[PDB]
Design a binder for these strands. Structure first.
Length: 849
DNA sequence: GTTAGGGT
């Protein structure tokens, strides 16, 4: 055992701490406690009854309204704004099965509709079952909720389904996503919402009494949330007979879901696309005859295949199939050659190029923009080239979707994003390298890694359809059929790669007290070893007690729309009065960093984050500094200029700004804040005290701690608390910096690509870790008294300061318990406040002089 | 010296 720096405090300070604690310990309307205790007493049968009675609004129908809409539908179908809207609707394949779907829904609880993109199942099946209910004189009994995997799709589909009815939004169709909602009318309505929204709505209505029909869309995509939703329906549908579910899927293992619901009726509806010709790597080299020059394993795959096509393809071509680098995106100048080939032959249309990540996209842009070949220079000024990446500006602009200048061709160099999320309408030709990136968690080593991998059959199939929007197209797949033969069916259901604490905590509010039993009933059962690893985290932050039952803190954490660690972080900042910077920290780690990453400028972006980080040496405080800057730029009417100067997305920041209010309002409604404003001065008296912020940041990111040991940009010798050597990711503002006032760091995500990096970090002090962490004991090991945290880091500490810090952790642990059970804002001159001021004082001993 | 893609 080694010994860190001395953390003993001056005598005058410990004397004040003991006095303030003596005050705290001279202390002697909680509806929350009665709610918490009820949830723990009742069994499931009793839980079912109570949620019935409490959500009984749909047990009521409106006959004067029933009739009026039935009268109004028949009448408004004869206008000359409709009947043209109906006739164009009836060209869609789904509408040809309208009356059978009506019947299959009447005769069965769960049906499934499988149909390719273009079939109109999603805009039409919701309308088909509403208009039927309205005419049958049943209108006010019908409330249809249809989920989507994505926010953007939920709106434009609802704006469209509202246009197909000659209505403004919020009459008979609505949408509701997080923090933004155009709600429909209460009854006789179609509401489009993201799966997350519906899952939060279950806390109040866990047996779906507040809807008559449920449509799950894009189930084949296997989002955690649709995967989760179908398990829960197995628990709900025995207690909800009047409830009608309609699952919806592409032609991607549709049978998994039909099996899953026991052999339910299944409609197949055909699509509306142009046919897109599939070319593979052999057929590409036959048309371009490109030459490459500057484990195998590769040969096991290619020679048995080359033999089956010895007489069907050229001889010089098939020898390049032996080169390991012909497939994938290994040779950019090859991919460079195929675009130039499309630009000359093969008629007019855009080129959408699918590359794995930021690095490979950046390479080809410069090749197409700054070519080394004469054939490249010939073309460069006749192509308008768009890189398409989440961290790049192009998605939030209008150009890439629209047509190029006259005489120039559009070439889109994209990651996996343009497969589902982004849709460019003038694409004819798709170049599919077949390579993508994926995040992998190894349960055994506690390492998340980011790897390039092959894509699956479902993906290529998705990218082929991307070419059939305007006219018949072509898809060039830069891998042979022998690769496709060995590719996976679908991607790993992401629930199998994900941490599970947040679901486990949520499941406790649906009176599903056993996560091992429940998660096994999903289509793909999660690793029970990852289920246990979930509970332990939750037990550690004390959202579950040692028996594993929900605790009063844990109910608050389950009622916040954020992972419990940062949920717990936010709650501390209410009790310690630093609300605004902390909820900036939380929204950022949950959602994402508002900074773009434009091509070439990465060096300049470092300088911007360095200036925004204000030498506070923390990525989380850096974003808050950005958010305070963004607010000032609104106050100056310089917002646009501000965002163009610092590579910032105003869309993100306003959404980051919205999450903070959602955080503040919840905390206020929960009785932890006196004001729902995240900016209010009382909620923020300590928002200027940096050593306090680092201590509340650490309370949430603990126990992901790092220790740094070397100085030289600067070279770093740093290891996480488990012994593995790490670095700051080059994107984090702590990369390369020297002269840290402290050698201890907390981080949210660590990840391996070319090294094991901490993607974000805040510099923290040993005293603050000791007070908010665990694994604390006082002792002697050398001939020195020590103080440790996580039983991992041992700090020189005299006895007088230890017995105060331990006594301080006792009182802190007593305060947090009572606040979870009996939430109220901390009064300014009460007993509770003295213990707070005792911690504020001990943490300011670490202030930068 | 570097960042697949969703969402409450």
């Amino acid at each position: 055992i080694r010994l860190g720096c001395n953390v003993s405090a001056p005598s005058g300070v410990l004397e004040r701490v003991k006095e303030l604690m003596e005050d705290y310990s001279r202390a002697p309307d909680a509806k929350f406690q009665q709610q918490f205790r009820h949830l723990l007493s009742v069994n499931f049968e009793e839980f079912v009854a109570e949620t019935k009675e409490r959500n009984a609004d749909l047990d009521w129908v409106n006959p004067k309204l029933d009739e009026r809409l039935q009268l109004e539908l028949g009448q408004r179908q004869l206008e000359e704004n409709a009947k043209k809207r109906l006739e164009a609707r009836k060209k869609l394949p789904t509408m040809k099965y309208a009356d059978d779907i009506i019947q299959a829904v009447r005769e069965n609880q769960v049906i499934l509709i499988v149909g390719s993109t273009g079939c109109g199942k999603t805009t039409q099946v919701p309308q088909i079952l509403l208009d039927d209910a309205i005419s049958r004189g049943c209108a006010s009994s019908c409330r249809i909720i249809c989920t989507q995997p994505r926010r953007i799709s939920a709106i434009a589909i609802a704006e469209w389904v509202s246009y197909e009815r000659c209505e403004s939004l919020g009459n008979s169709v609505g949408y509701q996503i997080r923090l933004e909602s155009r709600k429909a009318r209460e009854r006789a309505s179609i509401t489009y919402c993201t799966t997350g929204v519906l899952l939060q709505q279950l806390q109040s209505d866990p047996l779906m009494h507040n809807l008559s029909v449920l449509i799950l869309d894009e189930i084949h995509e296997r989002s955690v949330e649709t995967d989760l939703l179908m398990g829960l329906l197995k628990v709900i549908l025995p207690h909800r007979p009047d409830l009608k579910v309609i699952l919806m899927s592409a032609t991607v293992r549709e049978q998994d879901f039909c099996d899953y619901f026991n052999n339910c009726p299944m409609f197949r509806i055909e699509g509306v696309m142009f046919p897109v010709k599939m070319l593979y790597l052999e057929d590409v080299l036959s048309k371009t005859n490109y030459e490459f020059q500057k484990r195998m394993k590769h040969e096991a795959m290619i020679e048995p295949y080359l033999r089956r096509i010895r007489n069907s393809y050229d001889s010089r071509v098939l020898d390049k199939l032996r080169l390991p680098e012909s497939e994938g995106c290994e040779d950019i100048d090859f991919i460079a050659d195929l675009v130039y080939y499309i630009c000359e032959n093969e008629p007019e249309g855009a080129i959408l190029v699918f590359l794995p990540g930021y690095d490979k996209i950046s390479q080809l842009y410069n090749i197409l923009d700054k070519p080394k070949t004469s054939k490249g220079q010939r073309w460069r000024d006749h192509m308008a080239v768009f890189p398409l990446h989440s961290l790049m500006q192009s998605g939030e602009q209008q150009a890439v979707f629209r047509r190029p200048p006259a005489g120039q061709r559009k070439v889109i160099i994209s990651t996996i994003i343009a497969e589902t999320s982004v849709t460019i309408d003038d694409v004819v030709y798709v170049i599919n390298s077949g390579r993508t990136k994926a995040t992998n968690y190894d349960i055994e080593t506690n390492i998340q890694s980011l790897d390039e991998v092959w894509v699956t059959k479902a993906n290529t199939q998705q990218r082929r359809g991307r070419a059939g929007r305007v006219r018949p197209g072509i898809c060039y797949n830069l891998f042979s059929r022998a690769r496709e033969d060995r590719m996976d069916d679908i991607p790993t259901p992401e629930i199998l790669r994900s941490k599970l604490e947040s679901i486990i905590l949520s499941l406790k509010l649906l009176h599903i007290d056993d996560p091992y039993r429940f998660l096994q009933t999903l289509i793909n059962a999660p690793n029970p070893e990852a289920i246990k690893m979930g509970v332990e985290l939750l037990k550690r932050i004390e959202a579950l007690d040692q028996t594993g039952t929900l605790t009063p803190l844990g109910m608050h954490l389950a009622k916040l729309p954020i992972d419990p660690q940062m949920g717990k972080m936010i709650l501390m900042s209410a009790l310690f009065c630093c609300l605004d910077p902390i909820t900036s920290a939380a929204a950022a780690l949950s959602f994402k960093s508002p900074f773009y990453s434009p091509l070439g400028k990465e060096s300049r972006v470092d300088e911007i984050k360095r200036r925004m980080a204000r030498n506070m040496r923390s990525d989380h405080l850096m974003v808050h500094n950005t958010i305070i800057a963004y607010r000032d730029s609104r106050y100056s009417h310089a917002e646009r200029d501000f965002c163009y100067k610092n590579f910032l997305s105003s869309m993100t920041l306003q959404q980051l700004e919205r999450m903070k209010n959602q955080f503040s309002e919840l905390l206020y409604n929960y009785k932890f804040l006196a004001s729902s404003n995240c900016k209010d001065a009382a909620s923020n008296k300590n928002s200027e005290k940096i050593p306090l912020l680092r201590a509340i940041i650490g309370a949430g990111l603990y126990p992901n701690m790092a220790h740094l040991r070397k100085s030289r940009r600067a070279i770093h010798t740093m290891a996480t608390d488990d012994g593995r050597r790490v670095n700051f990711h080059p994107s984090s503002v702590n990369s390369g910096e020297s002269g840290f006032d402290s050698a201890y760091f907390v981080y949210f995500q660590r990840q391996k690509s070319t090294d094991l990096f901490l993607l974000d970090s805040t510099m923290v002090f040993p005293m603050a870790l000791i007070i908010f962490g665990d694994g604390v004991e006082a002792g002697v090991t050398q001939n020195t008294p020590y103080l440790c945290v996580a039983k991992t880091y041992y700090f020189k500490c005299n006895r007088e300061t230890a017995d105060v810090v331990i006594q301080l952790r006792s009182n802190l642990e007593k305060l947090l318990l009572k606040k979870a059970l009996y939430p109220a804002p901390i009064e300014e001159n009460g007993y509770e406040k003295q213990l707070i001021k005792a911690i504020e004082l001990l943490l300011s001993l670490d202030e930068r002089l």
